Design a protein around this ligand. Structure first.
Ligand code: PRO
Ligand code: MG
Length: 447
């Protein structure tokens, strides 16, 4: 079972465990004004009227999970990414095409209360969840589709960052979702009782919109998770492990849709860390798909096919005597190897960029005297071994998709980029003295 065997030291598990502590600190202090921010309105029913302008997925590209769906690591669309810095956060394709379109229509005479905003956010969650569930790579698995619940937790976390104004992705120069949200949140603040207005106020009397949006999220996150999981398959639950290996899980399917408190705390994990963890999992998952396509064009021992990356037929090639034989099937190995190497080269660059950004986020924590929303989280990473990039890279190695390689040669190790981002073994130059393939269906190295 990949679900049950996932390391208690996977980045997802370690980050979720710090996320729990952050969430706990945040809900420790009583907020007397909670109710003023409280909003009142395989797969199953998604009617919002039963269990509680424009639509959410319009204009958005689908195929978010395709092997060639690209991450965005450049500067114009990411806050904090600049052309003068190699260090960069990578917005995953799941984020890039998120179903947030309805939130671009919040600046209107109708959207004025916490209930009006919740309505819109539940509509976003329902649709985003519907897309994830209906296009997920595990949609047709015969096991409990835990993988879908994980992708939903990742979108739930991005939605929370959009709602809170912490999200780093800038879809275009207009920033309509954010501008709409700041208008709705100004109305909500004005609509509060004077005593609540002072609780959400800076020293100078001006509105503390950052704190107001944080508490709004915290207060409504449970209903938002319920909407997000409306279409979640019945036989799908969220699973996570504690530091001691204790298994934590939703109990009634649909990723905890019917259970109240969300089973996830990813919405309390810094966005950059969540994106890098998804980058690594999706890299390892996609790499397996790409290696298999390279193998079908390069090596088929049973059918006497043994090619090299140079398109040589290893069954008729002897590099030691300088005897090269290029048949008509092996040039296709060359073409698949060229294509695989371009993807690997692009992933290596994305990897170094996030590697640098990680160091920068850790350094920002060490040097920052003043407070910020991500400070306590980075304090906790430091308390554990994770101030070292090497210790954080071990967590990426431990991921569900990344750790799953029983073969010693092709084991994922982010601390050894040369081995992790190398050419496929099926692309290596012919063994020196050639290969002999028997009728048995196995090819042996000559001499
Ligand atoms: O991101 C960059 O290019 C440099 C190197 C690490 C800190 N800033
Ligand atoms: Mg930028």
């Amino acid at each position: 079972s990949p679900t049950l065997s996932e390391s208690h030291k996977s980045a997802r598990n370690v980050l979720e465990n710090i996320g729990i502590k952050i969430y706990n600190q945040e809900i420790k202090k009583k907020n007397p004004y909670e109710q003023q921010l409280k909003g009142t309105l395989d797969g199953n029913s998604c009617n919002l009227d039963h269990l509680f302008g424009r639509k959410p997925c319009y204009g958005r590209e689908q195929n978010r999970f395709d092997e060639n769906a690209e991450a965005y690591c450049n500067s114009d669309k990411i806050r904090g990414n600049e052309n003068n810095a190699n260090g960069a956060a990578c917005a995953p394709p799941r984020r890039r095409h998120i179903c947030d379109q309805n939130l671009e229509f919040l600046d209107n005479k109708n959207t004025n209360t916490a209930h009006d905003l919740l309505g819109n956010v539940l509509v976003t969650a329902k649709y985003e969840g519907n897309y994830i569930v209906n296009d997920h790579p595990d949609k047709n698995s015969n096991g409990n589709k835990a993988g879908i619940c994980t992708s939903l937790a990742r979108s739930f976390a991005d939605i929370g960052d959009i709602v809170r104004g912490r999200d780093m992705f800038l879809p275009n120069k207009d920033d309509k979702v954010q501008k709409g949200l700041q208008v709705v949140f100004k109305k909500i603040y004005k609509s509060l009782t004077p005593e609540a207005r002072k609780h959400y106020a800076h020293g100078d009397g001006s509105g503390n919109y950052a704190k107001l949006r944080e508490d709004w999220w915290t207060i409504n996150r449970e209903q938002i998770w319920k909407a997000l999981t409306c279409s979640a398959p019945y036989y799908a639950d969220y699973f996570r492990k504690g530091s001691d290996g204790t298994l934590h899980f939703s109990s009634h399917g649909k990723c905890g849709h019917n259970e109240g408190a969300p089973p996830t705390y990813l919405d309390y994990v810094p966005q950059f860390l969540r994106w890098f963890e998804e980058w690594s999992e999706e890299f390892c998952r996609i790499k397996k798909i790409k290696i298999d396509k390279v193998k079908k064009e390069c090596r088929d021992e049973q059918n006497k096919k043994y090619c090299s990356g140079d398109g040589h037929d290893c069954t008729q090639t002897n590099l030691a005597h300088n005897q090269i034989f290029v048949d008509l099937d092996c040039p296709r190995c060359q073409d698949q190897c060229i294509k695989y190497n371009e993807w690997i080269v692009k992933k290596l660059e994305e990897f170094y960029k996030q590697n640098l950004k990680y160091s920068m986020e850790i350094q920002k924590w060490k040097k920052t005297k003043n407070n910020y929303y991500d400070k306590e989280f980075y304090e906790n990473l430091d308390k554990k071994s994770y101030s070292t990039i090497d210790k954080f890279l071990n967590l990426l190695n431990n991921g569900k998709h990344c750790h799953d390689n029983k073969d010693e040669k092709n084991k994922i190790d982010f601390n050894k980029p040369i081995k992790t981002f190398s050419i496929s073994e099926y692309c290596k130059t012919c063994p020196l003295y050639g290969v002999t393939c028997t009728n048995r269906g196995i090819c042996i190295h000559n001499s």
